[PDB]
Amino acid sequence: LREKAKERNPDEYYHAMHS
Amino acid sequence: MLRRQARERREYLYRKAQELQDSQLQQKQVDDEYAATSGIMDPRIIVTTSRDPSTRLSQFAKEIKLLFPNAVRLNRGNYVMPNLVDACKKSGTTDLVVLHEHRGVPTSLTISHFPHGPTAQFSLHNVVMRHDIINAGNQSEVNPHLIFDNFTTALGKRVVCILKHLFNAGPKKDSERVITFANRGDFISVRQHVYVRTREGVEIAEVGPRFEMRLFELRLGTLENKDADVEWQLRRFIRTANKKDYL
Amino acid sequence: YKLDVLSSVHFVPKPAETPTISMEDAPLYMSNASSLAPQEI
Amino acid sequence: KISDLENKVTVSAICRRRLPVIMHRLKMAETIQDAVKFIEQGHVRVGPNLINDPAYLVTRNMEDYVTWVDNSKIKKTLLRYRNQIDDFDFS
Amino acid sequence: LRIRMSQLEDALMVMPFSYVLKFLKFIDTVMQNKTLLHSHLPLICKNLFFIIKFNHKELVSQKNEEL
Amino acid sequence: FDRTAKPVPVITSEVTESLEDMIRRRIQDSNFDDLQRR
Amino acid sequence: AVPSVQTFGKKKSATAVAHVKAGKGLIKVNGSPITLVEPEILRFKVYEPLLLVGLDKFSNIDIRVRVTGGGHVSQVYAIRQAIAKGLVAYHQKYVDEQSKNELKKAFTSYDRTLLIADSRRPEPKKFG
Amino acid sequence: PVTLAKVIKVLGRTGSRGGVTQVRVEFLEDTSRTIVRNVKGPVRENDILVLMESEREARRLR
Amino acid sequence: GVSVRDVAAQDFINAYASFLQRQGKLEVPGYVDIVKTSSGNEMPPQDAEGWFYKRAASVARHIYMRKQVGVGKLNKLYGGAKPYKHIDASGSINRKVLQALEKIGIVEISPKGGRRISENGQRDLDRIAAQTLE
Amino acid sequence: FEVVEEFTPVVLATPIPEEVQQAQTEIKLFNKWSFEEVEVKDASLVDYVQVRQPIFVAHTAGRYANKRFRKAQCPIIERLTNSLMMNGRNNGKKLKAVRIIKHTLDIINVLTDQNPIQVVVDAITNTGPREDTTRVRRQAVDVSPLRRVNQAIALLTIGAREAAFRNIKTIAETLAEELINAAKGSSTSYAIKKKDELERVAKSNR
Amino acid sequence: REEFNPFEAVGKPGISKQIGEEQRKRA
Amino acid sequence: RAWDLIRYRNFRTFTGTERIQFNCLAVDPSGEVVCAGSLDNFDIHVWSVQTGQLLDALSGHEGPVSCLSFSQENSVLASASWDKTIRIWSIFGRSQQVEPIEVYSDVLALSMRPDGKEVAVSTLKGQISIFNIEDAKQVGNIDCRKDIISGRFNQDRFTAKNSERSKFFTTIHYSFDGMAIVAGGNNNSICLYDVPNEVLLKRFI
RNA sequence: GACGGAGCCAGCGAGACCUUGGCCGAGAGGUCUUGGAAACUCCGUCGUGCUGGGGAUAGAGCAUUGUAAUUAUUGCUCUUCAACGAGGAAUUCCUAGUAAGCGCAAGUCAUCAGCUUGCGUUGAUUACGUCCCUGCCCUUUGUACACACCG
Lengths: 19, 247, 41, 91, 67, 38, 128, 62, 134, 206, 27, 205
What we know:
It is classed as ribosome. The entry lists the keywords SSU processome, ribosome assembly, RNA folding, RNA-protein interactions, ribosome. SSU processome maturation and disassembly, State G. The structure is cut from a larger assembly and holds 12 protein chains of 11 kinds. By secondary structure, chain G is an alpha+beta fold. Chain G has a single domain, classed as 2-Layer Sandwich (Ribosomal Protein S5, domain 2), CATH 3.30.230.10. Chain G is built from 4 helices and 5 strands. Chain G has a 5-stranded mixed beta sheet with strand order 1-2-5-3-4. In chain G, a hairpin with a 2-residue loop joins strand 1 (4-11) and strand 2. Chain H has one domain (1-62): CATH 2.40.50.140. Chain H contains no helices and 4 strands. Chain H has strands at 3-10, 21-27, 34-39, 48-51. In chain H, strands 3-2-1-4 form a 4-stranded antiparallel beta sheet, with no helix packed on it.
């Protein structure tokens, strides 16, 4: 979870983003 | 820009895995990190310490700066390691050296190779500073000659390469300064000598400092990345730890 | 060319007896002797 | 090495370099078909320039500057849920 | 001649003007002996050209007729 | 009683003469393991 | 809906979120009036935007600021820099472009930290 | 009385003692007249300096 | 529309401290003159006449600032540094002060533990809040 | 001819002090001291003592050690406040220096009706040594303007500090006194004296 | 050889532990 | 590569150790130092004209260097990149100093005043921002997004007004008098602006 | 600057015991239940007096922890009230979020137990020029692709 938490792209989009 | 480092680490870990497989098949040259720049671009070294360092670590950092021809000392006042590695990555630094102490007695030394590792940590024993020497005088800062003795295993050749590229390549044949790294049961004895070629032999004089290392952690990444995959560790609690040798 | 147009944002054009006139001349008035330095001579 | 170029090169490799495929791997679009519409509608930028052609292959040095146009209505949605929508940047 | 040429220009910038007036007088003396000028004419030309460039605004100031 | 780890060495004189001997033999033969331009 | 705009201001670890909407002139920070911010000596610091651009612009809008993290001075810098960004963004979104141009000119002329983040990224001054 | 002179050139390779720089300054009262002076603090172009004595010509100070 | 948050911090307590002192129904324990308010302190409150009433005003707001509050919170809230220990404030005084308030009706016992701002007290705090402004 | 940009009365539902409205009219130090009438008497200190940019408070968070001469652009009041804080125990406490200078400026306005910022600029102008010695024995050499202002600030601050180090006088009142005495040019101020023997020793070795 | 090895210019007292060890081997 | 226009010969060629891909260049007023920039390497290579050797590489960007220019009189280097920042390099002298200045968006073009006292930069947002080199502070800003004219492509499926393809200027240059800039980009417009007033003088199709 | 009130702002960190809350005690600390930060700011008292700075030593009490001793251990209350008034000859380091002040957390194989590492908070003076002194080096076959300069 840490290395994964480190390697965030802030630009990640998903259709559930709207709600 | 985060996506540059995110991708290349996958490339770096892939390259090391492929190199490891190739070596294993050969079991049945210079390391990939250093193969690009070995003997082409002179190393750029930053020497720093832990925060609020005691006076000795500041001087000891000044000493480790003097040992390597292209080393520069940096105070660690309030800096944050992700900022340090990014800032040292920013200036083109090749390696970063961090020093730790206990009551002004240096205890550990860590080397992290840029841009993408590896990171080697050392434990400092029997450290004798040259500041403990009266009327020692000033050094020679020429590109020193360099000795590696009693390095046989594959891990030894790796430790050789990591320490190898901290210095400038191509010293003059008559360069007067010699650095020796000598393993004696994982006990890398380090001395700084200066000689004169006589009519019937050679005479050497210690410049110092004297200080011993044991490698205890090698990882595939910068020292900041505590999640970096680990190539090797010193695993101390085995019943054979009291009599096993690695280097 | 084939791969460039795949990988180019902006237009990439296709790359292209009797005595011959040369389209390009790499000045005409300038002489080859005048283009040589004294140390070369 | 050259002897590898003869076998390493395959159609799938060039398809992987295709922009909608890269968007899917970068997870910008859930599906390859979806990525095509976003490219057609003009919400994607590769470095300084917007690309409308799905068949574009992104070269290796441009692949991390592929991102969304600043004023994409969807890029607003990215920041609206996370509540990082800063309107000084107009996004 | 002894002075290094890479170090001529700074030697001329440090030059006080009251000494420049003397330098012009020394340069003056050179031309009476045509041989002395011709022997090292290029160096005399350069030195004179830097002194005036260094002190052109000064030189326009002195209204002395003899100068 | 048993000791878990290797004891840290003591740099007595005899160790010191032995080490400096090897340094002198290396330089006498000019057998130097140092990096070179490539 | 009511015209509104959101922005952020960051100084060290201090972060302030400023929401600017159409209103009758209520500026609040952490739910309290801007007059009550502490330290009072740096109160005028957070006043630098309000005082430089004019209050009738603010008389025509509501601002609410929520601050978290960092120290007192860093929080004050976050508040000012966020509210400046919020005013200019509001004038862009719901007012003419000339107004935001004038506000940006005034803010950058007086103090650019009001609009750009001031981050002292480490720099090795010595080469090598 | 003290005169004022604006620095017109900071001289280099003057070998002055550490912390001392040799400069050339033109008097404000007379733009043409200029004098070489030794200054201790940092110096740059177009700054003006107070000369109590306008007669002494600077000498290189080891 | 006046609220306790709308008034300057030191002003509300001082005005509400005088409100409590003049009022004359706030119970004050006998030992107030003989305590520190904390073990880390070295001298007693200098304003022996009015510090408890100022203490009551100070807590009467913290319940307004923070909806639910208990004795443990006041102890840490008024605690201070002494190697340092950061000893919390005296538990006895804080409990007596809290108990004093709901006798007036300013505060009252909250559900799930702690104290609640007694709705009568909410206007009372607002009343002196308007008093300071006007 | 008349110009108006405001045609509706501005009442902010959040109350403001009227003094902040007059501050909207003009930027003043602590909203009490104006920079318009402050001018540097001595031409040499000009371009190195900066008073043209008005500020409400000394604290600015500006970056003035990047380049060799950024300090000239820093406001002089900020420089005095920043030099005030020394001795280790006061290190890191800039806002205290802001309070101290506020009280000092108040004391200046009390003792002399002149604008206190004018007193400060006059004092730093007076206390700047125009010539000094350098150890070869000694040889006399002139002084750069930035070094003049730096030495003036340092001398003023250290004199104010030592005068009240173990005296009933507080740092605010002693700082006000030495500023006034330096502005007058009287020998009573520590800085004026030290400037004097520096110049005298240089004259002896001229 | 002995003159120019200050660790065995002269070092501070206590930098070396030879005297401690030699006593031990004799024991 | 180095070319002489008097004898029309290539008298010198410079290349990186790993053949770094160059996009921008600058030449010293004295004509002894050359700096080139790359989109892949993030560092500015420096060469000596006389010798042809790599003096050093100027690191300092997270992003690809977009443009380079040396001051004609003062000889400072201004380097601008997609890192949202601009750096002023004082390479000449005993000590080297770098002054980074942050910008809102990625910079594409940089023009430097002939006086060498000011530098103008074009960003993706369509802003021409001028900064004082000595003070490292912004002195003016120009808005260009609205003035730019961009035509809808026949292949487009969205309108030109809603499009964002090119409302930035990929190239800018001062006037020698210093009061104007000519700006161009991947668009159908050249905009001539005025610095002191930040207004569009004329536009050309 | 010491003291008394009041006001408050962080980021690291997860292998029965922790705990929000109520009731007692001046405090230390007890008892009954639920879930699993300082520095710093405002207002006041004190004042050049080894003074309301300093808390070493000593006396009397109120409690905690084991363990089976009248044993120590860790805290709290009062009284007692020392050296220390800025530090010789000498000596070490240091250029920006740097020197310095400030508190918090984990002990994750070497090393460290009021010591090591990590986190955040406030935040400077001066220099950013020189080879003059010291020390360490490089060159004295342009070799260097044109122009220019040098010989």
